[PDB]
Design a protein around this ligand. Structure first.
Ligand SMILES: CN1CCN(c2ncccc2F)CC1=O
Length: 169
């Protein structure tokens, strides 16, 4: 029962124009089995478009590749990104966490979310007038991949609450 292919892909931006299917594959195979690996090229000139994609056999392999950033491929530092649910990636480092009610504290959010990435800010939202907890929070990470992993999960359970988590701008 394989994970959906969409969740096993990495977009690789910023390629050297001299990177090929073969050199991209040789590089990224260090972190897992690649079922697909392609450099996007112009249909007439064959000149590289400067980006490509690799598809791993498993999500854990995608994680391994992302944890090995920065990647220098054929002499240039590239920009890998995983897919999240217009074809444009909203690359952000902050999430909204809703449904946490009044009993959820910072350590609850930290203990859970720290396994997705390095946390820089936790903001538990309180009422401007009364100071009472409003039942939602924002978490800011040091890097976008944490957020990307978070928002593709179907479920998040924090402090016994089923939470709604979205990218925050
Ligand atoms: C995760 N991700 C982000 C980047 N991405 C792109 N695709 C095609 C062209 C340019 C792009 F930035 C789509 C995708 O798979």
């Amino acid at each position: 029962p394989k994970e959906p292919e969409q969740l096993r892909k990495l977009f690789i931006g910023g390629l050297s124009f001299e990177t090929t299917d073969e050199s991209l594959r040789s590089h990224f195979e260090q972190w897992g089995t690649l079922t697909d690996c392609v450099v996007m090229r112009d249909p007439n000139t064959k000149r590289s478009r400067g980006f490509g994609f690799v598809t791993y056999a498993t999500v854990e392999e995608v994680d391994a590749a992302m944890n090995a950033r920065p990647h220098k491929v054929d002499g240039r530092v590239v920009e890998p990104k995983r897919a999240v649910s217009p074809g444009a990636h909203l690359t952000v480092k902050k999430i909204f966490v809703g449904g946490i009610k009044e009993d959820t504290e910072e350590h609850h959010l930290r203990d859970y979310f720290e396994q997705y990435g390095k946390i820089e800010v936790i903001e538990i939202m309180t009422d401007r007038g009364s100071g009472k907890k409003r039942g939602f929070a924002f978490v800011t990470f040091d890097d976008h991949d944490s957020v990307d992993k978070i928002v593709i999960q179907k479920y998040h359970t924090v402090n016994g609450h089923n939470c709604e988590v979205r990218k925050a701008l």
